[PDB]
Design a protein around this ligand. Structure first.
Ligand code: NA
Length: 440
């Protein structure tokens, strides 16, 4: 029933999703400014131009985290605020902003867990192919250096990237995230340059740091299960597992890219010399897992790569946008612990979206979200029992925000955001986490 006395308890956000103030204090244009301002890309016509106004209202965010009894806050720094041209001079006003925010967090007893890259590539870099270019890896590392030099006296726990599978595949293969390209080959190239940027950044950060750091990367992992034991469905499960999970885990673990996937991708695979693989495998202090759903896979020979489609289970619960499968969190952690070298581990996102409203009494009665937390935290207890070296849990999200291609329409917060007034209110699931955490 109990977590470690020193366990990290937080909630998570990303800069473009919450900050607003997109032109303020020298901020440059990101690929998500471009993409959200492109008609038709966002479901509901919204942008991150205002979002939660957390650029001005991070004090209110800190107020929520305190009310919840949290001891940590996962958030991202916007590259466009720091190096507005992407490769070029720094913007001291950007760094001063996050400096003040860091001091405010520490003053409140909240450990900052900083993500350097949460999808907001400076547009001038995208103009030169973005993650399709190796040069972008080099300048990511330079950005990482600058940030750690200024803030690494106070922040020990850093993640280079958030969810490179999204940035590469949704951004450059499927076209549903910024920058919105639709080419497999470019998606795969982007994956390699993201990974190379990660590895270069780790090295740069260790050199630039004023004290030893605890550096990780954050991956979205989706445990995958064949719908039957047929060779066709099992192979479809392996292909999906490789496309999402092992493509990133293996090179990070020093195992190269998975050979099955290299053979499957054929001519679309990127050109990956041994020197790049050595850099990609730069030793980490921790690994973050973002966990939402499983994939129950059936073979789908006529679909695009990886030729595997989800077989829905209507007896399972569904949220606004996903199937619920808490057991998958235990499965993927047990696999990491036993099969891969990363440790310790943090759950850097876990949460759900629902059609939340303010009820007549003023509260938000999101029982399904409460039950979602309760069920996933039970699986974490099981994983801890099995010896998994788990050191923290961050709910996605602290508050409702701009949820990428779904816009403001898809509410993941444990706090409700009124996007007209910018008032935040804690949901019932938030109060449950508060009281659960206080018990711990
Ligand atoms: Na439902």
């Amino acid at each position: 029933e109990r977590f470690p006395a020193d366990f990290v308890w937080g909630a998570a956000t990303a800069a473009y999703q919450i900050e607003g103030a997109v032109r303020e204090d020298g901020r440059g244009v990101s690929i998500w400014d471009t993409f959200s301002h492109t008609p038709g890309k966002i479901a509901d016509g919204t942008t991150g131009d205002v979002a939660c106004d957390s650029y001005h209202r991070y004090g209110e965010d800190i107020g929520l985290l305190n009310a919840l009894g949290m001891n940590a806050y996962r958030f991202s720094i916007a590259w466009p605020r720091i190096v507005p041209l992407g490769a070029g001079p720094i913007n001291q006003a950007g760094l001063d902003h996050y400096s003040r925010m860091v001091d405010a967090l520490l003053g409140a007893g909240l450990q900052p867990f900083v993500t350097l890259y949460h999808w907001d590539l400076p547009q001038p870099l995208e103009d030169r192919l973005g993650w399709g270019s190796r040069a972008t890896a080099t300048v990511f590392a330079e950005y990482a250096d600058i940030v750690v030099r200024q803030l690494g006296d106070r922040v020990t726990h850093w993640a280079t990237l958030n969810e490179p599978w999204c940035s590469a595949m949704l951004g450059y293969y499927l076209g549903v995230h910024a920058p919105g390209h639709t080419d497999l080959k470019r998606g795969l190239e982007a994956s390699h340059n993201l990974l190379l940027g990660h590895g270069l950044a780790v090295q740069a950060m260790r050199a630039a740091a004023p004290q030893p750091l605890q550096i990780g990367i954050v991956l979205g992992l989706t445990p995958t299960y064949p719908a039957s034991d047929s060779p066709e469905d099992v192979a479809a499960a392996r292909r999906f597992d490789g496309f999402v999970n092992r493509w990133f885990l293996d090179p990070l673990a020093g195992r190269g890219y998975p050979q099955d996937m290299l053979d499957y991708y054929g001519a679309a695979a990127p050109q990956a010399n041994p020197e790049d693989l050595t850099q990609i495998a730069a030793p980490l202090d921790w690994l973050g897992v973002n966990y939402y759903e499983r994939m129950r896979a059936v073979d789908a020979p006529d679909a695009s790569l990886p030729q595997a489609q989800r077989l829905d289970d209507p007896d399972l619960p569904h949220t606004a946008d996903r199937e619920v499968y808490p057991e998958g969190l235990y499965d993927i952690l047990l696999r990491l612990h036993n099969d891969y070298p990363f440790r310790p581990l943090y759950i850097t996102e876990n949460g759900c979206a629902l059609h939340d409203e303010i009820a007549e009494d003023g509260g938000i009665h999101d029982g399904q979200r409460q039950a979602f937390f309760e069920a996933h935290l039970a699986q974490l207890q099981r994983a801890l029992a099995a010896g998994v070296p788990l050191k923290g849990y961050f709910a996605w999200s602290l508050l409702d925000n701009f949820e990428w291609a779904m816009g403001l329409s898809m509410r993941y917060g444990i706090c409700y955001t009124n996007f007209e007034t910018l008032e935040r209110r804690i949901k019932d699931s938030g109060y449950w986490l508060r009281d659960f955490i206080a018990g711990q």
